[PDB]
Design a protein around this ligand. Structure first.
Ligand code: CMP
Ligand code: CMP
Lengths: 50, 50, 48, 100, 100, 180, 197, 50, 197, 13
């Protein structure tokens, strides 16, 4: 992505448009939804994502 | 009208005099309003003996 | 579970005879499973 | 527009060919959100021809680089017109002068 | 055989169909977003087979099918906008499907 | 205004016969509009009109329980005489600039065609300043007087707003006195 | 004519046989109209047999039941005996068009009157007639059902002692024997075909 | 092999956000890192802010 | 409301209890409406044996299926079990009133939907249940219809056996028998009134 | 904060 500044930030921190991490952290979430069982399996997980 | 307010979240108290305040939530555009008028009156209106 | 797909006549020639009452068993099994208590682990594969 | 100029900018806005001009001075007959019609002056009019133009305009359309296109009048109707003048400004144009 | 287009699609939510004509095509004025359908196109399909597990699935819900495939147009992922204008081109020799 | 809708049109990018403007230019002639609704947080007004010449607020269908602030917030111009216009204009009450893009984002309630969403800037205020002159008491000349200059739309009483300032400031000040 | 007007708003989805179109308990969101074909209603004994409430032909609507009210789920299973085309429109669309158009409610409510009327007829034939009387009532009333091959002495239909049962309600062998009995009264004739002599 | 063709156009609009690049007439590039509520904007004697 | 504007030009009668308004076979000529009270709608077979198919309360229309088609015989006996205020509307002017105002038909058709639902349940549980289950569905639904008192933890009802004999249309002696057989099960406690735990 | 409330006693009115 294009970039910019966080003047407030500290060292370890970094701005992140969230969709990026969102789609990039999907199977974490799918294991996690099967774990919660809101999405008992993964079709419904993606549905509920939508 | 659909106002918001903050709740005093904590008084993290180091000492009797040296002390913190957490405070939230606010609508945006006020933390500086507050801090401005707060510190103005505190700096520019207080009685005492000397 | 197998590389096979066993079918009708052989069963009689293997098990004993029967063919039609198998069908009848089949339908009644659809009864006891279909009733929306076990049909839901499929019901989103209905959407497959 | 901008506000500081150099002077050329009028002379630029024309020979893009990006919008109509007054081929022949006249008066506006008809106006539309898409088009216009004029009456040509007699002296400019030639005998066999009726001497009226139409100008049908460029609405929302694309480039190679695929951005909007549109044209529209800077004028009113039932009013005189001198020749060579403009009819309609463009996506970045104003009174025959660029506006980006 | 010849491919074809019409509203008829299998395994549909009428949500998408709500905006498509009898020829299976969007009406103007609408707004759309990624994953919506634009035209229902389909292609003559052959036939195949499946695993015993999906067989077990289709065997109790009674899942039934046809011999044709979907090849329908959709909005790309991440995109949305307003429905304003279109066109169709058809052979001199091919029947111009009604709305053409 | 938060929405408008009209006869004869689908989408903003369309056009019309007998008109100078586009749709949206006229929408922008409307964003600069003022209303003083009395009882209601939302209405629809209506309009119908025909005949060559400008179309202003004078032409519209006013209901008596709302004060219009201008007759001549200019809107459009009829170029041709046979043209006619007929629209309805939904106004709400609110504050700020969550301009109904927020609504469609929040609301995929399946609307019909025609309903022109419009951006909302409920905020009435336009300009403001203050000056710290010296509130005269014969002794306490360190006292200060504040003169606040203001500019807004119509729709607004000054002392209404002032006492509302007092109201909400004190409401929050509760949390500074009462809740500790 | 009014039908084609209705269909002008529809999506015709086509369904081969066995297409279990509706499942009872599905929510009701969609109206159906038979464009082409005929279809079977079905209700299941909660563990065992399901029974055919009736058969339906061209000209009529399906899923009308849930319309007037929210949270209305589907009443019965609905399976494609034959391959069929069904027209698809929704609710409020439909409510709007009823504001626009009359005569659908006329025809369909009169047909509901026939529905409840013949349901009374079947409740009566259930209560009063012994089973031979029931089967014989069926033998009459289906010769006049428009599916009857003209036979110069009687009416001929290709029932195989199966749907006579589902409509009457009985085991199949005893239907064999009471046909074997109506074989003896010069009323009926058969080869798996059937003729009402 | 081609039998008839359809084509369509939608319309899309775009509005301003940080990361969107910006400049004038001197090489004077720049990118937005923030957009300011008008209150905390500095301003003049006449209140007519920047 | 709309109600009174309808009624103000209707020939109001007060019909006391048991009065046979309608003898079916009569040729339908006038629409009625229960302004107040309660009525039973019922039929017979030619040997005399008769069945109640419904009762209708204030808020309900009857003579409603004859209105549309001109000159067909009436459909069932309709006899006021109570002192009932009835409106009376000849069909020829009621059709004028429909031309003057629609939205009179959604509600009749909704309740015909309800009627055919429950009648389908009648025919089903007929096919299904030994009388035990039939009494089961009965005492359930009568503990659900809006005349059931509560016994603090339990639906009280007292709509006594003479009446339920006619509701299910069956011998009350077996009703008492199975009711005793359900008091064995303790789900019911019944003496004149039945209390459903 | 109390004293500020005391500043504002004029103008809740
Ligand atoms: N007794 C009956 N006779 C004829 N048709 C019926 C009967 N019961 C139900 N149906 C139809 O079967 C359908 C099943 O569910 P629907 O809600 O779609 O609407 C129902 C009616 O159209
Ligand atoms: N099986 C039934 N269950 C409930 N009510 C019925 C039944 N059959 C007929 N009715 C009622 O009896 C009425 C007789 O005349 P209608 O056909 O006008 O309308 C009929 C319904 O109101």
């Amino acid at each position: 992505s294009v970039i910019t500044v966080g003047p407030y930030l500290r060292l370890h921190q970094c701005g992140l448009p969230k969709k990026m991490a969102l789609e990039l952290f999907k199977p974490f979430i799918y294991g996690k939804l099967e774990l919660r069982g809101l999405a008992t399996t993964i079709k419904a997980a993606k549905k509920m994502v939508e | 009208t659909e106002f918001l307010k903050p709740r005093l979240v904590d008084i993290e108290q180091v000492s009797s005099t040296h002390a913190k305040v957490t405070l939230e939530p606010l609508e945006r555009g006020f933390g500086h309003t507050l801090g401005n008028a707060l510190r103005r009156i505190l700096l520019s209106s207080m009685p005492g003996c000397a | 579970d197998m590389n096979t797909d066993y079918t009708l006549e052989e069963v009689g020639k293997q098990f004993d005879v029967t063919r039609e009452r198998i069908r009848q068993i089949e339908a009644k099994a659809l009864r006891k499973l279909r009733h929306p208590s076990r049909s839901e682990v499929l019901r989103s594969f209905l959407d497959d | 527009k901008p506000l500081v100029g150099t002077g050329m900018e009028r002379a630029v806005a024309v020979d893009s060919g990006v919008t109509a001009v007054a081929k022949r001075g006249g008066v506006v007959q008809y106006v539309d959100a898409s088009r216009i019609v004029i009456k040509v002056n007699e002296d400019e009019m030639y005998p066999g021809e009726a001497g009226i133009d139409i100008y049908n305009l460029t609405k929302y359309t694309r480039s190679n680089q695929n951005t909007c296109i549109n044209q529209m009048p800077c004028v009113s109707l039932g009013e005189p017109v001198e020749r060579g003048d403009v009819l309609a400004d463009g996506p970045s144009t104003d009174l025959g002068e660029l506006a980006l | 055989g010849p491919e074809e287009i019409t509203a008829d699609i299998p395994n549909v939510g009428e949500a998408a169909l709500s905006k498509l004509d009898e020829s299976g095509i969007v009406y103007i004025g609408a707004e759309v977003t990624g994953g919506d359908i634009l035209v229902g196109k389909v292609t003559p399909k052959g036939e195949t087979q499946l695993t015993p597990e999906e067989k077990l699935l289709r065997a109790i819900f009674g899942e039934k099918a046809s011999d044709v495939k979907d090849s329908s147009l959709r909005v790309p992922n991440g995109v949305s906008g307003t429905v304003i204008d279109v066109q169709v081109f058809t052979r001199d020799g091919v029947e111009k499907d009604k709305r053409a | 205004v938060t929405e408008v809708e009209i006869d004869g049109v689908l989408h903003e990018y369309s056009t019309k016969e007998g008109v100078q403007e586009d749709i949206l230019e006229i929408l922008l002639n409307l964003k600069g509009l003022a209303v003083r609704v009395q009882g209601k947080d939302e209405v629809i007004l209506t309009l119908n009109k025909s005949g060559i010449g400008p179309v202003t607020a004078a032409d519209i269908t006013h209901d008596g329980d709302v004060e219009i602030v201008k007759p001549q917030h200019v809107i459009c111009h009829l170029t041709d005489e046979n043209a006619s216009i007929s629209m309805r204009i939904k106004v709400q009450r609110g504050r700020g600039y969550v301009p109904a893009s927020t609504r469609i984002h929040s609301e995929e309630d399946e609307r019909p065609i025609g309903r022109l969403l419009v951006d909302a800037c409920y905020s009435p205020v336009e300009r403001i300043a203050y000056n710290v002159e010296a509130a005269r008491v014969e002794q306490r000349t360190d006292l200060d007087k504040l003169v606040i200059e203001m500019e807004t739309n119509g729709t607004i009483d000054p002392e209404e707003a002032i006492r509302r300032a007092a109201t909400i400031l004190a409401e929050q000040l509760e949390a500074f006195v009462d809740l500790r | 004519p009014t039908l084609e007007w209705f269909l002008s708003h529809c999506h015709i989805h086509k369904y081969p046989s066995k297409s279990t179109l509706i499942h009872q308990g599905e929510k009701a969101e969609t109206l159906y109209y038979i464009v082409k074909g005929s279809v079977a209603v079905l209700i299941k004994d909660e563990e065992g047999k399901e029974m055919i409430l009736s058969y339906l032909n061209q000209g009529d609507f399906i899923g009308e039941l849930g319309l007037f009210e929210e949270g209305q789920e589907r009443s019965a299973w609905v399976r494609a005996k034959t391959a069929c085309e069904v027209a698809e429109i929704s609710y409020k669309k439909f409510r709007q068009l009823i504001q626009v158009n009359p005569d659908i409610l006329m025809r369909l409510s009169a047909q509901m009157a026939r529905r409840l009327q013949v349901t009374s007829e079947k409740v009566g034939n259930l209560a009063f007639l012994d089973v031979t009387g029931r089967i014989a009532q069926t033998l009459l009333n289906l010769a006049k059902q428009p599916d009857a091959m003209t036979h110069p002495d009687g009416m001929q239909i290709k029932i195989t002692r199966q749907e006579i049962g589902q409509i009457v309600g009985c085991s199949r062998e005893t239907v064999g024997r009471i046909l074997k009995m109506l074989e003896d009264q010069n009323l009926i004739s058969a080869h798996g075909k059937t003729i009402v002599v | 092999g081609v039998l008839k063709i359809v084509k369509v156009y939608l319309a899309v609009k775009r509005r301003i956000q940080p990361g969107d690049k910006m400049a004038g007439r001197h090489g004077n590039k720049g990118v937005i890192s923030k957009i300011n509520p008008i209150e905390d904007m500095p301003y003049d004697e006449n209140g007519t802010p920047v």
